[PDB]
Amino acid sequence: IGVTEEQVHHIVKQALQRYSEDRIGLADYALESGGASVISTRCSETYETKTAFGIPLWYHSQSPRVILQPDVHPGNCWAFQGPQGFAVVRLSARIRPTAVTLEHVPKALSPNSTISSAPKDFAIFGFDEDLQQEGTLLGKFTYDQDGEPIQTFHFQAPTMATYQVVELRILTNWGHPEYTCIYRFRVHGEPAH
Amino acid sequence: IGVTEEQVHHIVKQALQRYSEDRIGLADYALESGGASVISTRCSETYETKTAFGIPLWYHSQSPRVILQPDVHPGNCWAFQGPQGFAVVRLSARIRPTAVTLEHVPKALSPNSTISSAPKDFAIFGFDEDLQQEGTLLGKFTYDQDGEPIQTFHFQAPTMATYQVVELRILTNWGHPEYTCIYRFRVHGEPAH
Amino acid sequence: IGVTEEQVHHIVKQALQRYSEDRIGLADYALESGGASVISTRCSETYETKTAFGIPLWYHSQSPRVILQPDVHPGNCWAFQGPQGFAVVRLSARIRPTAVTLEHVPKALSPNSTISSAPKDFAIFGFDEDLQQEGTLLGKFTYDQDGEPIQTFHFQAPTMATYQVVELRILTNWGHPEYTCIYRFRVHGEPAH
C-alpha cells in the first residue's frame, strides 16, 4: 500500500497537535485553571511516614484540589483512607456532562509496576444544586489498571440536564490496604451555551 | 516511494526531540525562568465573577508575569480590559530581536471552540532604553484564530540594533466584549554575543 | 519493504505513550513528588546579577531541591560555584540502584548553543547510612554536551546492596568560568521490594 515520508510527517504533526491539546482534545470543566473543588470531599490521608524522616520545612500535603490539577508526576495525587471516598467539584461552567476522564500514573513509573492505590469502581453524580440535594447518578464505571493511564468514560444515555456541581465517588480501589489515590479527574460536556 | 519502519522511528524521535525543545526550538529571551515583566503594563482584569461563588482562600489572579510563563492550560493567561492593551518586558539578555511567538489555548479546549479573547492585531516595540524613550516599532502582525495555537512572527527587515526592553502592544482582539487574554509571549533573537 | 498508514499510527501512539512516561519510562526514586534533598549539598550560587536590575519582589533563587523537580525550562536549574560540587539525596524508597539520569537544557534553547555550565564528569555514591559513613562509589560517568539533553547512565556491575541515600558529585563542567548548573538528576533501581 505504502506511506510516503511526508505523509509520515503529517501524521506526526497531527499526533503532536492532539497530544498537546491536553492529550485527549476535550475541554475540562473541572480544571481548576477555570473553576474548582468544594470540600464535601473525603478526609485526606498522607501516603507516607517517610515523614517519620519527617516534616521537611518546605513540605505540605496534597489537598483534594490536586485532582483538578494537570500535574500528574508520581508525587501528585490526592489520597483518602481505604477503598471508598469522594470529592465534590464545582465546574467552571454550567454544562451538560457527556463524559469524564480519570488518570493514574503509568505502571512504568511505579514501584514494581503496581498501581494498587488506583481507583477501580466509581460513580458520577449531578447536583442540580449549588447545594446538597441528594445527587442524580450520571454514570458508573471502572478504571482499568491495564489499559492506558488516561481513561475517558462517556455517559450511556444522558439527559441534557445541566449541572455545575458533580461528585466523584469512588467505590473500590485496585487492592491497596491503606488508601486510594487520585491523580486527575476531568469533566467534559456541552455548555449551557 | 515508501518509508521503512525504522525511518518512521527516526522521524518520530526527531519530532519528539523538537516538540520537547519548547516546541519551536528557539531560545525565548522573554522567559521569566531567565529574565522578566516590568509593569508599564495594562491594568489587569479578572476574567470572571464565578467569584460572585467567590474568593476561594487559595485563589489569586493572573499577574502579567503569566505571559512569560510556559504554563498554558486553559486557566493560565493574563487579561486586560477591552480589545487594546500592553505589556512591557525586560529580556533576560540584550539581543537583536529577530522574531516573536504568541500562543493561545487550542480551540479544542475552549467553550464552543471560541477563542474570541484571543489577541488579533498586535505590535512590537524596542525601547533602546532601560527607560521610556518612546519605542521603535519592530513589527506589526496578526494572530490568526485559525492556524495553530503557537504562532511565530519574524521581523521583515530588522536592523541589528539591540534591545533588552520590548513592548507587546495589542491592537484588536477576536471580538470579545469584556477583555483580551494573553497566554504566552516569547522573544527570539541573536545575543549581543 | 514498506509501512502502512496504520502501522505509522501505532508507532506514533507508542512513542507518545513512552514520551509521556517521564520520557524514559523508568521510575525516579529521587523525584521530590515521592521523597527528597538533604543539604550536605554544595553552597548555591545565583547565575546572575541582572539582579544588579535587581530583586524582583516575587523572585527567589533555585534551592538544590530543583534537581529533583521535573520542570526543566531554561530558568530551572541549581547552580554551584566553579566546576566541582555535590548534592546528597534521600530517595523515596530503599532501592538497589541500577542507573541514574542527568539532563540539561537543549543546546537549541541556549544563548549561542552553548551549554558550558553543563556538568561533565561526575560520580555517584551510596551512603548505606541514613548518615555520613563515607560513601561507596557506585559509578563514574561523563555527561556529553552533544548527545541528547536527557542521558541515562547504568552501573557497570552493581552489587544488590540497597541504599536510600546517594550523592551526586560533579567533577568537571563543560568549561564555564563561574559555575555549573544542574537541571534534573534521577535515580533508577529495584526496590527492596
Swiss-Prot record, chains A, B, C:
Residues 35-192 form the SUN domain. Changing G85D: Decreases interaction with SYNE2. Glycans are attached at N112. Residues 1-193 are annotated as: Sufficient for interaction with SYNE1 and SYNE2. The chain holds residues 521 to 717 of 717 of the full protein. This is SUN domain-containing protein 2. Signal peptide: none annotated. Disulfide bonds join C77-C181. The coiled coil domains differentially mediate trimerization required for binding to nesprins and are proposed to dynamically regulate the oligomeric state by locking the SUN domain in an inactive confirmation. The coiled coil domains are proposed to be involved in load-bearing and force transmission from the cytoskeleton. The SUN domain may play a role in nuclear anchoring and/or migration. Widely expressed. Highly expressed in heart, lung and muscle. Weakly expressed in fetal heart. Slightly overexpressed in some heart tissues form patients with congenital heart defects. Changing A79E: Decreases interaction with SYNE2. Disrupts interaction with SYNE2. Changing D22N: Disrupts interaction with SYNE2. Core component of the LINC complex which is composed of inner nuclear membrane SUN domain-containing proteins coupled to outer nuclear membrane KASH domain-containing nesprins. SUN and KASH domain-containing proteins seem to bind each other promiscuously; however, differentially expression of LINC complex constituents is giving rise to specific assemblies. At least SUN1/2-containing core LINC complexes are proposed to be hexameric composed of three protomers of each KASH and SUN domain-containing protein. It comes from Homo sapiens (Human). The disulfide bond with SYNE2 is required for stability of the SUN2:SYNE2/KASH2 LINC complex under tensile forces though not required for the interaction. The disulfide bond is proposed to be conserved in LINC complexes involved in force transmission. Changing C43A: Decreases stability of the SUN2:SYNE2/KASH2 complex under tensile forces and inhibits force transmission through the complex. It comes from the Eukaryota. As a component of the LINC (LInker of Nucleoskeleton and Cytoskeleton) complex, involved in the connection between the nuclear lamina and the cytoskeleton. The nucleocytoplasmic interactions established by the LINC complex play an important role in the transmission of mechanical forces across the nuclear envelope and in nuclear movement and positioning. Specifically, SYNE2 and SUN2 assemble in arrays of transmembrane actin-associated nuclear (TAN) lines which are bound to F-actin cables and couple the nucleus to retrograde actin flow during actin-dependent nuclear movement. The gene is SUN2. It is found in: Nucleus inner membrane; Nucleus envelope; Endosome membrane.
